[PDB]
Design a protein around this ligand. Structure first.
Ligand SMILES: *C(=O)C(NC(=O)Cc1ccccc1)[C@@H]1N[C@@H](C(=O)O)C(C)(C)S1
Lengths: 194, 381
């Protein structure tokens, strides 16, 4: 079927009634992607609109379609800080082993780990190995947090099984990048962890 | 595509008041919803952080033990469902449940012009109350020590618009006042996350673009090459063909923060009294900001087609530092750009903190910003 610009706008803006009007009428394939690859669900996720997400999930939409930036609805939720929606999608069976947009190829886990601990834990409950899955530059969450996080973030990651010895594609450890980023506190903590 | 338009910063306690940043810090770029912070400064300067909107009810008993009520509105920009439910609770507590005639003037702004407010009053105010939304509100109200009725109900026969200029209170009428929460709470709610409504209604209440241009010129010696506003919210006034966004320079955003902080400080307040705190204000766009920003950073976000933005203060070991980050995006062409830009902004701000000896937590407990507080009870004027 055809995508509807009106449905996609409604889903992003958070207008539940209009979403219901356009959907139940059934002139619209809910899995049809628009010009930039967007679905209604991706729009709802991006806008943090939990009720619309739930409505769409009750229609059994495909969770794994990707836009032109290669992102699923779950990546839209995580990357736009809609962690309520992210938890809903993870419970509905959304694949957590995905890549979010940008040159680094960060994992979903790595993005959640810098921001929302609950969601980071929900991702690992699905796939415990993600703790050490590296991005395109050979960097794990440990690297991101070494740069821009806290000793408590480092402890979180170590508790979930972070390998301390990994080296990125430049041959740097997480300690190396902490120092390069002038993060005194994480460099200190990382130097001391065994 | 995502790239930086401009980033700038300045230490709050800077003697020299030199704004540091890139060579684009004097170029205008789209602000999106950091515009709400400029609107905050204006409101704070024109009204004061403790100002309250005083909605008046003119209440007259009628033949059959009922009441006529006229609402003389205050243009309170946060009079929606929640404030309506509180009003209904208050009318009940005063034993007003039988209303023959409910009238209202043009300053009575009700977003859940006269035609529409009449419709919302009939549709929503006078109809049955949601137990879902009501109990949630009541229980929230209890957390700030505000008492509300159990199962409040109202019966309204007739509703109509009556212009302020054409209203005369009956000599048998009693004038009651329903005060808003203080402006600082309204601004806090706005800046946590909001659609355009609160910001745009503040901006209009204060006189709109003409008055804004006059204010910012006096306040900052700023002309249109520094800052060009069309509304309070920063949302697009035009189209996706012809977009019209509030724009301003990165330096102007630093001056706005400086002045806002100075005006708040004169009444014992901080930026955290009107803006969201990273990882502490959970009902805000920065509720899940992690890393060195968590607990240290007070900030407002913005997103529009062509920009992702952030501004506020970071609390570091070297002191409080103002910052603004204005990113370019092409959300029309790649909806993923907002998320990409958001993390790059986070990393830039985290780097600013790293370079100033790391974070230092601010003193702050998460506020619960309702449109009323314990002084909002219906009271005789
Ligand atoms: C201010 O920037 C905001 N922007 C909009 O309302 C633009 C828009 C257009 C279509 C769909 C969603 C948003 C509000 N503040 C944003 C922010 O703080 O980042 C927002 C996305 C939460 S909406």
């Amino acid at each position: 079927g055809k995508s509807s610009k009106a449905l996609n706008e409604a889903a992003e803006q958070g207008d539940l009634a209009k979403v219901k009007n356009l959907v139940q009428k059934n002139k619209i394939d809910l899995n049809a992607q628009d010009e930039t690859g967007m679905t209604p669900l991706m729009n709802a996720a991006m806008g943090g609109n939990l009720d619309i997400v739930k409505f769409l999930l009750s229609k059994k939409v495909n969770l794994e379609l990707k836009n032109n930036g290669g992102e699923t609805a779950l990546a839209f939720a995580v990357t736009n800080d809609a962690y309520d929606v992210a938890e809903e999608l993870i419970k509905a069976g959304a694949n957590v082993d995905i890549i979010v947009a940008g040159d680094e190829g960060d994992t979903l886990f790595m993005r959640a780990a810098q921001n929302n601990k609950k969601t980071a834990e929900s991702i690992l409950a699905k796939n415990k190995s993600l703790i050490n899955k590296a991005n395109t530059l050979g960097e794990t969450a440990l690297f991101a947090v070494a740069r821009y996080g806290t000793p408590a973030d480092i402890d979180f990651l170590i508790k979930k099984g972070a390998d301390l010895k990994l080296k990125n594609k430049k041959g740097q450890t997480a300690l190396d990048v902490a120092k390069e980023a002038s993060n005194q506190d994480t460099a200190k903590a990382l130097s001391k962890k065994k | 595509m995502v790239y930086l338009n401009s980033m700038c910063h300045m230490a709050a306690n800077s003697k020299t008041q030199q704004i540091q940043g890139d060579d684009n810090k004097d170029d205008k770029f789209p602000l999106a919803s950091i515009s709400k912070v400029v609107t905050t400064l204006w409101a704070v300067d024109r009204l004061g952080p403790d100002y309250r909107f005083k909605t008046k009810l003119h209440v007259t008993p009628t033949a059959n033990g009922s009441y006529d009520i006229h609402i003389e509105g205050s243009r309170d920009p946060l009079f929606g469902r929640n404030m309506s439910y509180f009003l209904i609770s208050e009318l009940n507590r005063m034993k007003i449940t039988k209303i023959e005639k409910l009238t209202f003037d043009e300053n009575f702004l009700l977003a859940w012009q006269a035609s529409i407010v009449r419709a919302t009053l009939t549709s929503s105010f006078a109809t049955a109350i949601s137990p879902g939304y009501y109990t949630i509100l009541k229980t929230k109200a209890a957390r700030i020590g505000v008492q509300m009725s159990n199962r409040p109900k109202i019966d309204v026969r007739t509703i109509s618009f009556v212009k302020k200029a054409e209203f005369q209170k009956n000599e048998k009428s009693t004038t009651m006042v329903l005060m808003s929460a203080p402006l600082k709470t309204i601004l806090k709610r706005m800046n946590n996350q909001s659609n355009n409504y609160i910001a745009d209604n503040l901006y209009w209440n204060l006189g709109g673009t003409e008055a804004f241009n006059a204010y910012i010129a006096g306040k900052m010696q700023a002309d249109t090459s520094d800052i060009e506003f069309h509304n309070g919210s920063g949302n697009n006034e035009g189209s996706v063909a012809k977009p019209v966004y509030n724009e301003a320079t990165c330096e102007m955003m630093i001056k706005v923060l400086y002045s806002l902080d100075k005006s708040l400080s004169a009444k014992g307040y901080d930026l955290s009294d009107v803006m969201a705190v990273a990882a502490k204000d959970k009902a805000s766009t920065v509720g899940s900001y992690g890393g060195v920003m968590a607990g240290s950073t007070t900030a407002k976000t913005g997103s529009v087609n062509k920009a992702k933005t952030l501004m506020g203060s970071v609390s570091t070991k070297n002191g409080e530092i103002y910052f603004a980050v204005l990113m370019h995006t092409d959300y029309d062409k790649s909806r993923s750009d907002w998320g990409v830009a958001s993390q790059q902004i986070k990393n830039k701000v985290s780097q600013l903190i790293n370079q100033n000896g790391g974070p230092k937590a601010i003193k702050y407990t998460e506020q619960l910003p309702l449109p009323f507080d314990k002084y909002s009870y219906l009271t005789k004027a």
